[PDB]
């Protein structure tokens, strides 16, 4: 240990294209094991939702 230091910050929101999937005709979100996710868009009106596993 010496007097030099570097700061660590919180992580950013990481996008994942593979997470979303298709049903017969629909959009499906299946978060990985023990993971919470946020789903967003304006396809009609705005929708910001949070899914907890």
């Amino acid at each position: 240990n010496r007097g030099a230091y570097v700061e660590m910050h919180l992580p950013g929101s990481e996008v994942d294209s593979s997470l979303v999937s298709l049903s017969g005709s629909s959009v499906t979100v299946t978060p990985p094991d023990g993971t919470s996710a946020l789903v967003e868009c304006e396809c009609g009106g705005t929708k910001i939702s949070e899914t907890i596993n």
Epitope: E42, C43, G44, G45, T46
Partner: nanobody, 125 residues
Amino acid sequence: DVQLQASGGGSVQAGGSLRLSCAASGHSFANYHVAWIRQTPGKEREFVGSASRRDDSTYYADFALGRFIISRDNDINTAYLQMNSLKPEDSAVYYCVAAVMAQTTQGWTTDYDLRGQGTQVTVSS
């Protein structure tokens, strides 16, 4: 001034059909999301449906699905709301709202980039 005029309402028996029109004077609908907002007396303005030219998408509320249709003819800068199967709960005044994206369509829009005069529809049981 860019003004929107709504028309096509009136008194019609339940189970019929009607066609409302929103026309813009001063600017076209070429880059405007068109949203229909309904105001029944005694309550708050309620969302009906929205249409988008950029992605050709249409949003309909729970009561509006399977009954209401929205179309746009940019040639005469007008937006049409063709709806059928009247019910007594549909008596209200309708306004048309035009917005340049800006993420204004979140649930309750409550933005009104362009506000226009509405028209009253009465439903007789």
